[PDB]
Amino acid sequence: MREIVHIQAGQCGNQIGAKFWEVISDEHGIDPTGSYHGDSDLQLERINVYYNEATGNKYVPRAILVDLEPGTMDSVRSGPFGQIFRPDNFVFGQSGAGNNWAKGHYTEGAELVDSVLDVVRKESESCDCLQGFQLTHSLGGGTGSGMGTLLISKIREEYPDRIMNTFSVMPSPKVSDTVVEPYNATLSVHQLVENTDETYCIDNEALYDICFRTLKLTTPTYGDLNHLVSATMSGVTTCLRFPGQLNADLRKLAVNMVPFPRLHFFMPGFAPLTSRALTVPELTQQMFDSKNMMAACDPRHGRYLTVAAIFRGRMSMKEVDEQMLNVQNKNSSYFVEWIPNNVKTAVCDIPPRGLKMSATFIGNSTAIQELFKRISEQFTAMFRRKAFLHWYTGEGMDEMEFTEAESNMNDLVSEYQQYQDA
Amino acid sequence: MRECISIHVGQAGVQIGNACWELYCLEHGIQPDGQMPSDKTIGGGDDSFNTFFSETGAGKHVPRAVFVDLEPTVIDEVRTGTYRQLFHPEQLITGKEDAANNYARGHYTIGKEIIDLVLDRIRKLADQCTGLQGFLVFHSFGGGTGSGFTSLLMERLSVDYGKKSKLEFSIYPAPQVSTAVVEPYNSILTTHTTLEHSDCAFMVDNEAIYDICRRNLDIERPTYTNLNRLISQIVSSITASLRFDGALNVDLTEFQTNLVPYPRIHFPLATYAPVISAEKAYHEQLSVAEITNACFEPANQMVKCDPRHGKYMACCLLYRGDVVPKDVNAAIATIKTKRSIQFVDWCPTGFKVGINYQPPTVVPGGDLAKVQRAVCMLSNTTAIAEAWARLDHKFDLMYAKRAFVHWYVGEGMEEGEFSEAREDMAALEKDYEEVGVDS
Amino acid sequence: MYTFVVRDENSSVYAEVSRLLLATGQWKRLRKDNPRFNLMLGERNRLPFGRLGHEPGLVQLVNYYRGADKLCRKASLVKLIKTSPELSESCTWFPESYVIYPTDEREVFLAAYNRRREGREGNVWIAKSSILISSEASELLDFIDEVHVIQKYLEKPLLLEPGHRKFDIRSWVLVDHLYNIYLYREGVLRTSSEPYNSANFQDKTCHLTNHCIQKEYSKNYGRYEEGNEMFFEEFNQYLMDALNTTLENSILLQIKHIIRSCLMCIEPAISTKHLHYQSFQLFGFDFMVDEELKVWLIEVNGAPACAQKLYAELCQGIVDVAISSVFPLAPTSIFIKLHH
Amino acid sequence: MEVIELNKCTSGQSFEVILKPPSDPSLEEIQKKLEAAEERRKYQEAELLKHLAE
Ligand SMILES: Nc1nc2c(ncn2[C@@H]2O[C@H](COP(=O)(O)OP(=O)(O)OP(=O)(O)O)[C@@H](O)[C@H]2O)c(=O)[nH]1
Ligand SMILES: COc1cc2c(c(OC)c1OC)-c1ccc(SC)c(=O)cc1[C@H](NC(C)=O)CC2
Ligand SMILES: Nc1nc2c(ncn2[C@@H]2O[C@H](COP(=O)(O)OP(=O)(O)O)[C@@H](O)[C@H]2O)c(=O)[nH]1
Ligand SMILES: [Cl-]
Ligand SMILES: [Mg+2]
Ligand SMILES: [Mg+2]
Ligand SMILES: [Mg+2]
Ligand SMILES: [Mg+2]
Ligand SMILES: [Mg+2]
Ligand SMILES: [Mg+2]
Ligand SMILES: [Mg+2]
């Protein structure tokens, strides 16, 4: 359990992915050319988890950039850290997906998927011991939603005993592009229930609300939304990337955070929310607050199955344990009493850029059903009148596949409610 | 002379292994490189210390030890550290990917691929023993390797080395230490599979070691290095009788004879004192009366329980340093009347006492203080059952909902094995009841 | 905000404490099987003491001393008093009882019985378990043989006038986490409004000293006090007028002595000075008083109910000295502090 | 209270002080149960690759 292979699919996945590589390269002291110019070594210790070592002390990301149209991937190469990526890891089509799950999954994406798997296999063969894969993508579009879930299924066929991790961006009417996003999301959620170990639910509704309320931005761009995501992605991968006292790989995270196979859709959080010094009680209070959650769900409307906190910066370990147990013991109604010791805490000395200290939250709450209900209602509103189905049935699908995906997500909601009342 | 091979399984086993063999080296005057100036017999001699150390013609003193872990980073610290020259590379064994805090993965999936390799390296050590006694197995209850692979090894050691003794040093899980959430499963699965195959098992609750480091050494947040150095003192006090010349606990079978009347009931409660801070640079030396008194306080035990509500089957005192029999007899008589020491009806209510005049060595610049007399009390009490009851309750809470079971079933284990293992712990709890009360 | 759990539904004392803790606006109740608590109001039987004091960060308290049943079980009390090198032989205040089983005191019971049957000192003995009375040994042994004790029945009790009636004195003792013994200054006498019989060797009405068993068997529930409960201001006045002594001198010095001797004996077995969980407990000592004003111990009740009017004051005393001593909030001591 | 069997040497000494008097599997089954786990893993992998082929 050493190397991780990153994949990024579609517009959202590549833009979020590019920001993730900006942040962690800066933390690990890797400049845009790929050269290490850093002060500490607590940066190179587990650098090979996300980077390969080429000759001349060059550190190149173990990343694969995927899209069905070249526009967004050309923008990544033109961007600040576009030099660092392997040029032959850019796998791109010309046609585009048209925000259609069917085009990404069945017709247009099926052409390109073998070329991606060749790069995945080329990267996986050179690994000393592959942990698994992490994917960044949206569920509202075509490529990242459709082809990303196709990639997940194909990667599982070839690597069935490796961990499959995802950073899935959920659609919302507040930051919506197309009206067919509930179809695309419902189809993808059904795929993610089967073929992933760990999914981080990054709701655009929450990211918009965090930018609009607090932070206080009247007009948030995708860059403002992605600032929160790249901060979160840095936070949750901290134990994988640095030598924290906690022993840390993707399988151990899955073993402890996932009590039941289908329930692996986590609710991330972050503090402080950024765009000057914060204490341990204030961090602990913020990360558990509903206003700091990256999924638009009140955790007070459900119960925590498992929780995973990651404090970053040089602080008192005693004060962390007191404050975590303060929050935990005195809000004990919102934790399940049938999984003892279900909140764990890790501490890393190196903080993120431009913060003295921070705290990242990872929660397997039953309140995540609110997110899936919201998409189920948006789905069913349109599906009961067969609205916009001609886009999908024109690509060879039929109504039965939609009916199944709807039933499967409603089962998932029903399953979260089953364990909430226990 | 009769040898003793020490096996170290998983992270906890290896890192505690480092603490023990570091200490052993300082106690015998063995240097990092392996030279022992005190040893005049080169390449042999069969002294009391040779039970743990073999010798080469060059004058290197090599631990009779095998370090095993399913991932390399922990054993790599042994290979890179101060005592790399101590161990021959064949002793240090590492897998690629680890057991992920899963008993089933460590036992069945990954363990099966590495078990024949580990027994071969043990056989290499065993072939160079004139008169082997048995084994000392260091591991964790909570860890996937420590639970899973250890139980497989303990099964295979009963086949391959049938008549030999097998002693356990087990690290019992504590949420202060940050465990996994599924360690209650791993603890009960490995205990079930190992129960028939282990002769004597010294449980060490990390909660007790953590709180002793907090309370006595005045540490804000004890690291593993703090815990292991404290634990290694207790291991040293237990193993001292094998390594040094004396006439008590002098062979591993005596631990079994003295402490274990019922074969299943083989979990003695260790109690060590004094634990003193190095910041207290001049401290007022504790007498034999005081440290023997400390052996009946719950604060100084290795497992947190109340011996007052239970019954002693055997009690055994291992003094180290400036002690004589008169001091111990005077201390025992004073303690007799004060404390409520209830023994079982069908056992002699006595204390088997051992003194080794060489006082407890400490690691230079360590948090522990150098003292002139210390004691470790090994006592088979029914109050240890409390530890099983806590752990069995944590199991029942999760297993009532089948929580985390799919991870074990996914590695080939069955749901029957959970309830099998649980019913054996239910039987074990009942065995402590039958022995520990009048009705 | 502190946290506590309730595992005894029909504890009138600790249900009142539960309500008084909520009145502070600083305690709040959890479901009973939640381990994350500061205070356990535990179940009376099979309280899981082994699982207490292991939850990290939480100082855990409980309202029962483990092994205090030693004192509170009638059979274990007799075994304790006899086998202890601090009480037996030296002690006199306990009526010398004997244990019988369905090792046993078949041998010992008949030793003292025979020399009493020779002399003029009466030979009445009362039988009970952890409610029969007879002068003959034959009439007791039948129901016994399918924990049982045979105690020396007090044939010469102190009488209340008018009426020549019998009583037993209940006094509440609170032993806190530091083992400071606190006697509640208001006690109570469970009287019997029916006059005391003597020559009748079969009747069991006045003979029984209870409040509840005096309800069913007797219609006369007393107009001179209500119900069958007399308090420390009235009984002190009766003693001063009739006997020319106070409650303090004649009786209360002996009560405080017996409370000390019983609790100090078990202290090193039950105390939680250097333990991973703390504990307090409310005991209810029951006493008898003979015609020479010597006080006799009858039974120590480990989970006692209080009297109706005294619930408000006593339960406030419990939360002040026992609970809030360990868990401070943001007098007129209602207790008498016995040392230890 | 009395002390019995006191032994001595330059390194130390030891004794007993009495206070009151008194009143399996085989190698075949191991490799069988291990291979039974392997077959159940291979069965669960087979049903997956079957289901993925669908
Ligand atoms: N005393 C002590 N306990 C430890 C140490 N390392 C881990 N533990 C404890 O052991 C349990 C975890 O077991 P590990 O030994 O880390 O796991 P492992 O046996 O390597 O198994 P995998 O990690 O799954 O391969 C936890 O309950 C820890 O508290 C150590 O150095 N000292
Ligand atoms: C990949 O890094 C992580 C590793 C683990 C964990 C982890 O998440 C913090 C991690 O993510 C930050 C981890 C997470 C959560 C829980 S709550 C049920 C848990 O019990 C156990 C763990 C484990 N160990 C500890 C001490 O927390 C597994 C290790
Ligand atoms: N947070 C975030 N969401 C995005 C971004 N770009 C697109 N989305 C969301 O993703 C969905 C559209 O997916 P997109 O990636 O454009 O389609 P694809 O390129 O075919 O995968 C919509 O619901 C958008 O709100 C981005 O940069 N950040
Ligand atoms: Cl053999
Ligand atoms: Mg085409
Ligand atoms: Mg091809
Ligand atoms: Mg788009
Ligand atoms: Mg390990
Ligand atoms: Mg020699
Ligand atoms: Mg054997
Ligand atoms: Mg597997």
mmCIF file of C-alpha atoms in Angstrom, chain A residues 210 213-215 228 269-275 286 291-292 294:
data_model
loop_
_atom_site.group_PDB
_atom_site.id
_atom_site.type_symbol
_atom_site.label_atom_id
_atom_site.label_comp_id
_atom_site.label_asym_id
_atom_site.label_seq_id
_atom_site.Cartn_x
_atom_site.Cartn_y
_atom_site.Cartn_z
ATOM 1 C CA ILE A 210 -20.448 28.630 1.907
ATOM 2 C CA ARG A 213 -23.268 33.171 3.256
ATOM 3 C CA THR A 214 -20.174 33.711 5.441
ATOM 4 C CA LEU A 215 -17.185 34.297 3.086
ATOM 5 C CA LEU A 228 -12.944 25.107 -1.055
ATOM 6 C CA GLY A 269 -15.869 19.605 6.045
ATOM 7 C CA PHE A 270 -13.201 22.265 6.585
ATOM 8 C CA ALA A 271 -12.091 25.030 8.969
ATOM 9 C CA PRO A 272 -11.164 27.823 8.793
ATOM 10 C CA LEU A 273 -12.972 28.849 5.599
ATOM 11 C CA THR A 274 -10.449 30.853 3.558
ATOM 12 C CA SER A 275 -10.031 33.141 0.520
ATOM 13 C CA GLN A 286 -16.426 24.986 13.264
ATOM 14 C CA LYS A 291 -22.173 25.740 7.794
ATOM 15 C CA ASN A 292 -18.717 24.113 7.265
ATOM 16 C CA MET A 294 -19.232 20.462 1.846
#
